[PDB]
Amino acid sequence: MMAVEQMPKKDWYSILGADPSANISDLKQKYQKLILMYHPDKQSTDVPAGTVEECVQKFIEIDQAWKILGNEETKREYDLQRCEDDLRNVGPVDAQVYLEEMSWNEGDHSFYLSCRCGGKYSVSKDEAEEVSLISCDTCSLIIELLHYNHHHHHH
Ligand SMILES: [Zn+2]
């Protein structure tokens, strides 16, 4: 039981200094301006190595807030967007898993699978009912969540 405010606290909103109440509009014009000023404008060619670490960092930085200027709810729809599209392209490469294998927990009513490399997955009884494509967070592979009915004896 805690307050349901969910305020910002990342380098994103700090990169553009845009309050959590701001909108994409105000952030639009403020972006080209803020970012512009954020770019390097000093006269110093004495940055060995770091010169790149800074350039490449500033690129991902300005872009970081550009989309997720705030919390995840800010603009995460775009993230998963390319994901769901990048996952389908892979299709069935690893293998298919049976719901009878995914250890079901009566505590939270959910199932979870463990890869044979190191990582593992965990989906909710409801989630797995809405989704199907499940990839591993370690090795380049993906499995399919198939729900097959076997046990049938009324509870
Ligand atoms: Zn794996």
Curated annotation (Swiss-Prot):
Alphabetized SUPFAM superfamilies for the sequence = Chaperone J-domain (SSF46565), CSL zinc finger (SSF144217)
Q: Which residues form the J domain?
A: 11-82
Annotated GO MF terms? ATPase activator activity; ferrous iron binding; zinc ion binding
Which GO BP terms, alphabetically? chaperone-mediated protein folding; positive regulation of ATP-dependent activity; protein histidyl modification to diphthamide
Q: In which pathway does it act?
A: Protein modification; peptidyl-diphthamide biosynthesis
* Gene Ontology cellular component list: actin cytoskeleton; cytoplasm
Domain-related comment: The DPH-type metal-binding (MB) domain can bind either zinc or iron ions.
Describe the protein's quaternary organization and the partners it interacts with.
Answer: Monomer and homooligomer. Iron binding promotes oligomerization.
Gene symbol here is DNAJC24
Q: Which domain of life is it from?
A: Eukaryota
The organism that produces this protein has a lineage beginning with: Eukaryota, Metazoa, Chordata, Craniata, Vertebrata
Task: Keywords in alphabetical order, please.
Answer: Cytoplasm, Cytoskeleton, Electron transport, Iron, Metal-binding, Transport, Zinc
The source organism is Homo sapiens
| Pfam families, per the entry | DnaJ (PF00226), Zn_ribbon_CSL (PF05207)
Where does the record place it?
Cytoplasm, Cytoskeleton
Which InterPro entries does this chain map to?
A: DnaJ_domain (IPR001623), DPH_MB_dom (IPR007872), DPH_MB_sf (IPR036671), J_dom_sf (IPR036869)
Positions contributing to Zn(2+) binding: C115, C117, C136, C139
- Which protein family is it in? Belongs to the DPH4 family.
Q: What name is this protein filed under?
A: DnaJ homolog subfamily C member 24
Function of the molecule: Stimulates the ATPase activity of several Hsp70-type chaperones. This ability is enhanced by iron-binding. The iron-bound form is redox-active and can function as electron carrier. Plays a role in the diphthamide biosynthesis, a post-translational modification of histidine which occurs in translation elongation factor 2 (EEF2) which can be ADP-ribosylated by diphtheria toxin and by Pseudomonas exotoxin A (Eta).
Residue ranges of domain DPH-type MB in the record = 93-148
